[PDB]
C-alpha cells in the first residue's frame, strides 16, 4: 500500500522511530484523531475558501490548549501547506497500524457470539504470535450472534487472512451433500 | 499595480505565478517580469494572464523568450491588459506586441 | 482531545462567514466558465448572478465545488 | 429500500450516495423525488449503471435532470425495471417506464 497517504504516515513514523518517541507519537494521534471525527473543526481545515493564516492561528490555538510537540504540529503544518489537510483522517488511521507494522504488534480480530476468558484469548494469540512472528501480540473481540459454531479471525496486512472455524464446516457441508 | 508576484512554475511557454491572498490580477491583464538575460541586466518577459488557477495561484502565458527565467522570480502587475500606442505616432514604424518600435529608429510618443 | 470554547467559537464563526445559506464563492474561472465553492442547495441549469451581475447559468454540478 | 442522497449530477449521469453498509445492486432503479419549475414535487427515475464504491453508485437518469438538486432525497427499489405486462399493454403506448401516455387512463 504505496497510497497517496501511506509515505505520509512512514515519513512520521520514521521519524518518530529514530527520535524515540513513538508510544507518545500515537497517544497524541490518537488525539488528533478524537480531533478529526468531528465534522466543524474537519471542515474548517478541509475547505479550501478559508485563509491561512487564521488557520495557522487556530492550529497553534489547539497546540497551546492540548499541549504537543513540534514532532506532531510540523506534520499538520506540513499538511495544511501541501493541501493534504482532505486526507489527515486517512493518514492517521493508517499510521496506528504502520505503527503496529515498524513496532510488531499485530492486532487480531475475531467475531463469533464470544463470551470468552484470558484462555481463549491468550492462547490464540500465542499462537498467531507463533505462527505470524508478532514481538508482541495483541488482541481484539467482536461480539455477534449470527455465527453458531465457533468463531471467525481475522488477521494480515489488513485483514487479509482468514481461518473461521463457525461456518466454514457449515458451508463445506452444505456445498458437499452435493459436491 | 504596487505587488509582488513569484514565478512558480514554468513548463515551457506557460508561467505559474503566485501573488498575495487579497490582490489578484484580472484575466487578461498583463504582468511584466523583472527578470535578467545571461548578463544580468534587468530585462523583461511580459506576460499576459488567461486564468485563475485557484489555492491564490494563476497560470499566465509569457509573450517573450521563457530560456533564464527561474523559479523565484519576481513580477509585477501593470492592472490593464497590454496597451499599445495609437495614432499618428504609429505610422511608419516596425511594431511588436510589446508596442516595441522593433526598427532601428528612435523612441515613440 | 480538548476543543476550547475560544477555538470552538471562533471555528463556527468563520465557518458561518464562508457558508452563507444562499450564496458561495468563486474557486477558479479558466475562459469563461467557472467552479464555485459551495451551493449546496441549488439546481442545475438554475441562474447564479456573481458579484457585479455578470450573469451565469449551473451545469457541472460536482460534489466539492459546481460548474 | 435505503433513502439516499445526491452526490452530484452532471447532466444525466448521477452520483448517489447511500448508507454504508447496504447498496443497490448494480441495474436498480433509483427514484428521486424532486420538485418541478414551480416546486410541485414530481419524480424522476435513474438507472444504477455501475458502482464506483465508498458508498456511491453511478446513476443514469431516464428522465431530464431538471428538477433535482444536490443532496435531494434518492429512494432505492431494489427490484430491477418493473413495467406492467397483461392485457393492459395492448393498446396503449407507453413511456420508457411503464406510465402511460395514451391518456385514456392509468395503468391496471
Known amino acids: 500500500v504505496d497510497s497517496t497517504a501511506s509515505r505520509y504516515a512512514s515519513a512520521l513514523a520514521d521519524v518518530a522511530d529514530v527520535t524515540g518517541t513513538l508510544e507518545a507519537t500515537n497517544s497524541d494521534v490518537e488525539k488528533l484523531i478524537r480531533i478529526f471525527s468531528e465534522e466543524p473543526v474537519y471542515y474548517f481545515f478541509a475547505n479550501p475558501v478559508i485563509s491561512i493564516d487564521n488557520k495557522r492561528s487556530v492550529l497553534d490555538e489547539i497546540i497551546t490548549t492540548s499541549g504537543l510537540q513540534p514532532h506532531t504540529a510540523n506534520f499538520i503544518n506540513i499538511l495544511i501547506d501541501s493541501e493534504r489537510i482532505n486526507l489527515v483522517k486517512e493518514i492517521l488511521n493508517e499510521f496506528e497500524d504502520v505503527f503496529n507494522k515498524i513496532t510488531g504488534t499485530e492486532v487480531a480480530v475475531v467475531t463469533s457470539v464470544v463470551k470468552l476468558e484470558n484462555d481463549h484469548l491468550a492462547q490464540i494469540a500465542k499462537g498467531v504470535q507463533k505462527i505470524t512472528g508478532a514481538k508482541n501480540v495483541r488482541i481484539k473481540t467482536v461480539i455477534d450472534p449470527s455465527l453458531v459454531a465457533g468463531f471467525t479471525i481475522r488477521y494480515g496486512n489488513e485483514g487479509s487472512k482468514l481461518v473461521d472455524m463457525s461456518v466454514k464446516k457449515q458451508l463445506e457441508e452444505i456445498a458437499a451433500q452435493l459436491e | ?109 | 482531545d480538548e476543543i476550547s470554547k475560544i477555538i470552538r467559537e471562533r471555528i463556527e464563526g468563520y465557518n458561518r462567514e464562508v457558508k452563507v445559506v444562499n450564496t458561495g464563492t468563486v474557486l477558479q474561472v479558466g475562459d469563461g466558465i467557472a467552479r464555485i465553492h459551495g451551493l449546496d442547495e441549488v439546481m442545475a441549469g438554475e441562474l447564479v448572478e456573481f458579484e457585479e451581475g455578470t450573469i451565469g447559468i449551473a451545469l457541472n454540478l460536482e460534489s466539492n465545488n459546481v460548474g
Open chain 2, 1 to 109: 499595480k504596487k505587488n509582488l508576484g513569484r514565478i512558480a512554475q514554468i513548463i515551457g511557454p506557460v508561467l505559474d505565478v503566485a501573488f498575495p491572498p487579497g490582490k489578484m490580477p484580472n484575466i487578461y491583464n498583463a504582468l511584466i517580469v523583472k527578470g535578467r538575460d545571461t548578463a544580468g541586466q534587468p530585462m523583461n518577459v511580459t506576460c499576459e494572464v488567461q486564468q485563475l488557477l485557484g489555492n491564490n495561484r494563476v497560470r499566465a502565458v509569457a509573450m517573450s523568450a521563457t530560456d533564464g527565467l527561474t523559479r523565484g522570480m519576481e513580477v509585477i502587475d501593470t492592472g490593464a491588459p497590454l496597451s499599445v500606442p495609437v495614432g499618428g505616432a504609429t505610422l511608419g514604424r516596425i511594431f511588436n506586441v510589446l508596442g516595441e518600435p522593433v526598427d532601428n529608429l528612435g523612441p515613440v510618443d
